[PDB]
Write an enzyme that holds these catalytic residues in place. Structure first.
Site, PDB file in Angstrom:
ATOM      1  N   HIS A  72      80.680  12.145   0.116  1.00 35.96           N
ATOM      2  CA  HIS A  72      81.628  11.231  -0.515  1.00 35.96           C
ATOM      3  C   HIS A  72      82.995  11.862  -0.791  1.00 35.96           C
ATOM      4  O   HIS A  72      83.825  11.295  -1.556  1.00 35.96           O
ATOM      5  CB  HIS A  72      80.953  10.712  -1.792  1.00 35.96           C
ATOM      6  CG  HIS A  72      79.779   9.852  -1.343  1.00 35.96           C
ATOM      7  ND1 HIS A  72      79.856   8.620  -0.870  1.00 35.96           N
ATOM      8  CD2 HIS A  72      78.478  10.254  -1.251  1.00 35.96           C
ATOM      9  CE1 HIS A  72      78.652   8.260  -0.483  1.00 35.96           C
ATOM     10  NE2 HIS A  72      77.839   9.258  -0.719  1.00 35.96           N
ATOM     11  N   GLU A  98      75.322  18.728  -0.092  1.00 35.48           N
ATOM     12  CA  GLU A  98      74.408  17.623   0.036  1.00 35.48           C
ATOM     13  C   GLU A  98      75.076  16.558   0.918  1.00 35.48           C
ATOM     14  O   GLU A  98      76.021  15.887   0.471  1.00 35.48           O
ATOM     15  CB  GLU A  98      74.074  16.981  -1.327  1.00 35.48           C
ATOM     16  CG  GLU A  98      73.002  15.882  -1.118  1.00 35.48           C
ATOM     17  CD  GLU A  98      73.191  14.574  -1.852  1.00 35.48           C
ATOM     18  OE1 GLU A  98      74.286  14.302  -2.341  1.00 35.48           O
ATOM     19  OE2 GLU A  98      72.228  13.804  -1.947  1.00 35.48           O
ATOM     20  N   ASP A 109      77.231  18.452  -4.911  1.00 32.90           N
ATOM     21  CA  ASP A 109      76.700  17.120  -4.988  1.00 32.90           C
ATOM     22  C   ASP A 109      77.598  16.137  -4.269  1.00 32.90           C
ATOM     23  O   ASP A 109      78.825  16.128  -4.395  1.00 32.90           O
ATOM     24  CB  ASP A 109      76.547  16.711  -6.452  1.00 32.90           C
ATOM     25  CG  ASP A 109      75.957  15.314  -6.600  1.00 32.90           C
ATOM     26  OD1 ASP A 109      74.787  15.071  -6.226  1.00 32.90           O
ATOM     27  OD2 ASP A 109      76.699  14.462  -7.081  1.00 32.90           O
ATOM     28  N   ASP A 159      85.724   7.601  -9.006  1.00 33.76           N
ATOM     29  CA  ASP A 159      85.884   8.538  -7.894  1.00 33.76           C
ATOM     30  C   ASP A 159      87.134   9.386  -8.084  1.00 33.76           C
ATOM     31  O   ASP A 159      88.250   8.870  -8.195  1.00 33.76           O
ATOM     32  CB  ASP A 159      85.938   7.726  -6.600  1.00 33.76           C
ATOM     33  CG  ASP A 159      85.548   8.557  -5.412  1.00 33.76           C
ATOM     34  OD1 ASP A 159      84.430   9.019  -5.337  1.00 33.76           O
ATOM     35  OD2 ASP A 159      86.353   8.754  -4.526  1.00 33.76           O
TER      36      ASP A 159
HETATM   37  C1  LIG Z   1      71.203   9.186  -4.346  1.00 33.38           C
HETATM   38  C2  LIG Z   1      72.077   9.449  -3.170  1.00 33.38           C
HETATM   39  O1  LIG Z   1      72.721   8.219  -2.830  1.00 33.38           O
HETATM   40  C3  LIG Z   1      73.571   8.277  -1.674  1.00 33.38           C
HETATM   41  O2  LIG Z   1      72.815   8.467  -0.483  1.00 33.38           O
HETATM   42  C4  LIG Z   1      72.852   7.372   0.395  1.00 33.38           C
HETATM   43  C5  LIG Z   1      71.562   6.533   0.222  1.00 33.38           C
HETATM   44  C6  LIG Z   1      71.556   5.745  -1.092  1.00 33.38           C
HETATM   45  O3  LIG Z   1      72.567   4.737  -1.087  1.00 33.38           O
HETATM   46  O4  LIG Z   1      71.503   5.604   1.283  1.00 33.38           O
HETATM   47  C7  LIG Z   1      71.532   6.238   2.536  1.00 33.38           C
HETATM   48  O5  LIG Z   1      71.321   5.284   3.530  1.00 33.38           O
HETATM   49  C8  LIG Z   1      72.873   6.914   2.731  1.00 33.38           C
HETATM   50  O6  LIG Z   1      73.022   7.411   4.051  1.00 33.38           O
HETATM   51  C9  LIG Z   1      72.944   8.013   1.737  1.00 33.38           C
HETATM   52  O7  LIG Z   1      74.149   8.722   1.948  1.00 33.38           O
HETATM   53  C10 LIG Z   1      74.595   9.426  -1.773  1.00 33.38           C
HETATM   54  O8  LIG Z   1      75.204   9.693  -0.504  1.00 33.38           O
HETATM   55  C11 LIG Z   1      73.964  10.749  -2.222  1.00 33.38           C
HETATM   56  O9  LIG Z   1      75.012  11.675  -2.421  1.00 33.38           O
HETATM   57  C12 LIG Z   1      73.131  10.504  -3.494  1.00 33.38           C
HETATM   58  N1  LIG Z   1      72.462  11.723  -3.981  1.00 33.38           N
HETATM   59  C13 LIG Z   1      73.236  12.510  -4.954  1.00 33.38           C
HETATM   60  C14 LIG Z   1      74.403  11.774  -5.644  1.00 33.38           C
HETATM   61  C15 LIG Z   1      74.277  11.324  -6.921  1.00 33.38           C
HETATM   62  C16 LIG Z   1      75.544  10.957  -7.672  1.00 33.38           C
HETATM   63  O10 LIG Z   1      75.995  12.141  -8.338  1.00 33.38           O
HETATM   64  C17 LIG Z   1      72.942  11.224  -7.667  1.00 33.38           C
HETATM   65  O11 LIG Z   1      72.689   9.837  -7.903  1.00 33.38           O
HETATM   66  C18 LIG Z   1      71.938   9.601  -9.076  1.00 33.38           C
HETATM   67  O12 LIG Z   1      72.772   9.431 -10.205  1.00 33.38           O
HETATM   68  C19 LIG Z   1      73.524   8.202 -10.199  1.00 33.38           C
HETATM   69  C20 LIG Z   1      74.493   8.243 -11.366  1.00 33.38           C
HETATM   70  O13 LIG Z   1      73.815   8.258 -12.608  1.00 33.38           O
HETATM   71  C21 LIG Z   1      72.537   7.029 -10.215  1.00 33.38           C
HETATM   72  O14 LIG Z   1      73.159   5.789 -10.365  1.00 33.38           O
HETATM   73  C22 LIG Z   1      72.912   5.312 -11.665  1.00 33.38           C
HETATM   74  O15 LIG Z   1      74.077   5.204 -12.379  1.00 33.38           O
HETATM   75  C23 LIG Z   1      75.012   4.316 -11.778  1.00 33.38           C
HETATM   76  C24 LIG Z   1      76.200   4.234 -12.718  1.00 33.38           C
HETATM   77  O16 LIG Z   1      77.269   4.917 -12.099  1.00 33.38           O
HETATM   78  C25 LIG Z   1      74.397   2.907 -11.622  1.00 33.38           C
HETATM   79  O17 LIG Z   1      75.235   2.068 -10.874  1.00 33.38           O
HETATM   80  C26 LIG Z   1      73.070   2.985 -10.880  1.00 33.38           C
HETATM   81  O18 LIG Z   1      72.442   1.700 -10.823  1.00 33.38           O
HETATM   82  C27 LIG Z   1      72.205   3.993 -11.566  1.00 33.38           C
HETATM   83  O19 LIG Z   1      71.014   4.135 -10.819  1.00 33.38           O
HETATM   84  C28 LIG Z   1      71.770   7.047  -8.919  1.00 33.38           C
HETATM   85  O20 LIG Z   1      70.827   5.989  -8.841  1.00 33.38           O
HETATM   86  C29 LIG Z   1      71.020   8.378  -8.860  1.00 33.38           C
HETATM   87  O21 LIG Z   1      70.453   8.497  -7.573  1.00 33.38           O
HETATM   88  C30 LIG Z   1      71.778  11.888  -6.882  1.00 33.38           C
HETATM   89  O22 LIG Z   1      70.763  12.361  -7.748  1.00 33.38           O
HETATM   90  C31 LIG Z   1      72.316  13.058  -6.074  1.00 33.38           C
HETATM   91  O23 LIG Z   1      71.243  13.820  -5.602  1.00 33.38           O
HETATM   92 CA   LIG Z   2      84.945  10.462  -3.251  1.00 31.28          CA
HETATM   93 CL   LIG Z   3      69.908  17.920  -2.295  1.00 27.42          CL
END
Ligand SMILES: [C]=C1O[C](O[C]2[C]([C][O])O[C]([O])[C]([O])[C]2[O])[C]([O])[C]([O])[C]1[N][C]1[C]=C([C]=O)/C(=O/[C]2O[C]([C][O])[C](O[C]3O[C]([C][O])[C]([O])[C]([O])[C]3[O])[C]([O])[C]2[O])[C]([O])[C]1[O]
Ligand SMILES: [Ca+2]
Ligand SMILES: [Cl-]
EC number: 3.2.1.1
Length: 496
Positions: free
Chosen positions: A201, A233, A197, A167
């Site tokens: 998070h 997303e 994407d 991360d």
């Molecule tokens: C897929 C998704 O996931 C999550 O969402 C969540 C669910 C499940 O856990 O549950 C519910 O309840 C909650 O509320 C929600 O929130 C998250 O948030 C989102 O953002 C996602 N979607 C996105 C993202 C990503 C990352 O860039 C992707 O995923 C894919 O790729 C990955 C990486 O390659 C895979 O995994 C793989 O590899 C790993 C290594 O690191 C291992 O551990 C596993 O076993 C394998 O499988 C996954 O599975 C896939 O899905 C996506 O595409 C985007 O759109």
């Molecule tokens: Ca993060």
């Molecule tokens: Cl999406």
């Protein structure tokens, strides 16, 4: 951010999931430009780790090892050539930006990466970027496993590892600047915007700091001070700590309630009925229309990843899938994204497909080209739903009716439903198990219109059903419940 930046009057994007850059440029010129598609969401363009167990899954592309434009879809020159060729025919390119993480922390050290960069995920060394161990959030995460153990705590889902992915410490300017430079390199080539994407998070304000660093769009194709289109997303079906609204300052958000509810209504599960779709949109608890990116299925939940679960309709349920997509494309809510998939062998054990890892058509690891058959369908197990007549013609209907009010709703109290869009288009659906025979007020000038679901207007004739609307706007519709495609759609440009 919320303005899609499509050429004027193009209203949908297509996800051409796992397609090579050369195939997307040829598709822009032979098909997407001519048929009125607004743009294309492509798979992650940057280098990823090579996953050998299982053999080359689609999801290895969600494991970054650098920001080199070097993937199974192509190299940098092929990417720039695709973005120039599509832009020149009025089709924009949207990049899937994988910026929350690098690869999985248990991946092996070495150069088994798509461009040969070295990385040692165990010591958090990504010398090709470069990232080092202090560019990651290991010390900031407080769980015993280091992963997200509960989605009821905002700190662990933003600071801990999503399924073991390293991360990134996005509060630091170094990481922020490294990601902004990758994205600005993409904007300069001519990309119109990004799917961000796993936005859930990351903290909304770290995303915003990256966005504040981005360049205006390339003025060879875009107006003066155009800002990149951003859709985030975030899976928020409810019942968790994080809400979609936290991300509305940054741009649009994926509304995942839309395909989950639509699927249920069209499958007629849980007592749902198509006549309940009268107030579809914010009336059903969805986010503001101007904030939403909408879709029936995406690459994750069509194979049971993410969220959506069993009601999601996919190409595997073709007949129901086309009425869900036709309804989405005819309704005014959201900015619409259409899916384009490849076929894989499904193998269900205990109700789950254990083959949901299988990657794109390939010949020993190199992705097969999209071949077009004489009947405009694709070969090599690419299913090309964006080429199915019913889907193709409904992305055209959405361009014809853009900006027109929802008008002239009718339903039979159960699952036959109809509505128009100003005096420019009208669609009628029969999802009951008996037939439809009604004379409906369409709102269109009188005349003979070609139905664009069963056919096309070719010169001064139709290849399918012909609807006559009389001088006052009414037309009699008859649709059998056994019909191929149980719904008809006519619009100002399919008038004879
Ligand atoms: C897929 C998704 O996931 C999550 O969402 C969540 C669910 C499940 O856990 O549950 C519910 O309840 C909650 O509320 C929600 O929130 C998250 O948030 C989102 O953002 C996602 N979607 C996105 C993202 C990503 C990352 O860039 C992707 O995923 C894919 O790729 C990955 C990486 O390659 C895979 O995994 C793989 O590899 C790993 C290594 O690191 C291992 O551990 C596993 O076993 C394998 O499988 C996954 O599975 C896939 O899905 C996506 O595409 C985007 O759109
Ligand atoms: Ca993060
Ligand atoms: Cl999406």
């Amino acid at each position: 951010q919320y303005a899609p930046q499509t050429q004027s009057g193009r209203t949908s994007i297509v996800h051409l999931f796992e397609w090579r850059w050369v195939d997307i440029a040829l598709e822009c010129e032979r098909y997407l430009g001519p048929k009125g598609f607004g743009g294309v969401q492509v798979s992650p363009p940057n280098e990823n780790v090579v996953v050998t167990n299982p053999s080359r899954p689609w999801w290895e592309r969600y494991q970054p090892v650098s920001y080199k434009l070097c993937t199974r879809s192509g190299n940098e020159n092929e990417f720039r050539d695709m973005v120039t060729r599509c832009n020149n025919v009025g089709v924009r390119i949207y990049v899937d930006a994988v910026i929350n993480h690098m690869c999985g922390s248990g991946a092996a050290a070495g150069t088994g990466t798509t461009c040969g960069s070295y990385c040692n995920p165990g010591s958090r060394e990504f010398p090709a970027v470069p990232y080092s161990a202090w560019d990651f959030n290991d010390g900031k995460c407080k769980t015993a496993s280091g992963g997200i153990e509960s989605y009821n705590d905002p700190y662990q889902v933003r600071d801990c590892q999503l399924v073991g992915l390293l991360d990134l410490a996005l509060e630091k300017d170094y990481v922020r600047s490294m990601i902004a430079d990758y994205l600005n390199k993409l904007i300069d080539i001519g990309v119109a915007g990004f799917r961000i994407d796993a936005s859930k998070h990351m903290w909304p304000g770290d995303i915003k700091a990256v966005l504040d660093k981005l360049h205006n769009l390339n003025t060879n194709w875009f107006p003066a001070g155009s800002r990149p289109f951003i859709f985030q997303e975030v899976i928020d079906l409810g019942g968790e700590a994080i809400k979609s609204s936290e991300y509305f300052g940054n741009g649009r958000v994926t509304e995942f309630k839309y395909g989950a509810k639509l699927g249920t209504v069209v499958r007629k599960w849980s007592g749902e009925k198509m006549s309940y779709l009268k107030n579809w949109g914010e009336g059903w608890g969805f986010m503001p229309s101007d904030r939403a990116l909408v879709f029936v299925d995406n690459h994750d939940n069509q194979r049971g990843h993410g969220a959506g679960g069993s009601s999601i309709l996919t190409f595997w349920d073709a007949r129901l899938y086309k009425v869900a997509v036709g309804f989405m494309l005819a309704h005014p809510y959201g900015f619409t994204r259409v899916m384009s998939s490849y076929r894989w062998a499904r193998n269900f054990v205990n109700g789950e497909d254990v083959n949901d890892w299988i990657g794109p058509p390939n010949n020993n690891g190199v992705i097969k080209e999209v071949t077009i058959n004489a009947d405009t369908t694709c070969g090599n197990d690419w299913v090309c739903e964006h080429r199915w007549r019913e889907i193709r013609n409904m992305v055209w209907f959405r361009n014809v009716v853009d900006g027109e009010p929802f008008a002239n709703w009718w339903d039979n109290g159960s699952n036959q439903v109809a509505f128009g869009r100003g005096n420019r288009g009208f669609i009628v659906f029969n999802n009951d198990d008996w037939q439809l025979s009604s004379t409906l007020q369409t709102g269109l000038p009188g005349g003979t219109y070609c139905d664009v679901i069963s056919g096309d207007k070719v010169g001064n004739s139709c290849t399918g059903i012909k609807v006559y609307v009389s001088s006052d706007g009414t037309a009699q519709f008859s649709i059998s419940n056994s019909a191929e495609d149980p719904f008809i759609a006519i619009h100002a440009e399919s008038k004879l």
